[PDB]
Amino acid sequence: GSSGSSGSVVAKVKIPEGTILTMDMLTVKVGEPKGYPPEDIFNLVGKKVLVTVEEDDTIMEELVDNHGKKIKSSGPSSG
């Protein structure tokens, strides 16, 4: 079927800025894909937040910094 109220990954608790994500601080509010998908959820678990998220709040890609994997200075700002 088309309909899939999979939900979006919302913060399970307040995630203060500068903290790294873990599954113990996340959940997926089954209802609407308003925010981050529960499919790519693992990519979030390891990123750092840019703002103090509140409990049950909708996490977004603009609220997490990019990955710090690549051993090289490249990637111009999209903002």
Swiss-Prot record:
Domain AFP-like: 8-67
Taxonomic superkingdom: Eukaryota
Tissue: Ubiquitous.
Disease implication from the record: Spondyloepimetaphyseal dysplasia, Genevieve type: An autosomal recessive disorder characterized by global developmental delay with infantile onset, intellectual disability, skeletal dysplasia, and short stature. Skeletal findings include flat vertebral bodies with irregular vertebral plates, irregular and flared metaphyses with vertical striations, small and irregular epiphyses, premature carpal ossification and small carpal bones.
Transmembrane segment boundaries: none
Name used for this protein in its record: N-acetylneuraminate-9-phosphate synthase
Its biological purpose: Catalyzes the condensation of phosphoenolpyruvate (PEP) and N-acetylmannosamine 6-phosphate (ManNAc-6-P) to synthesize N-acetylneuraminate-9-phosphate (Neu5Ac-9-P). Also catalyzes the condensation of PEP and D-mannose 6-phosphate (Man-6-P) to produce 3-deoxy-D-glycero-beta-D-galacto-non-2-ulopyranosonate 9-phosphate (KDN-9-P). Neu5Ac-9-P and KDN-9-P are the phosphorylated forms of sialic acids N-acetylneuraminic acid (Neu5Ac) and deaminoneuraminic acid (KDN), respectively. Required for brain and skeletal development.
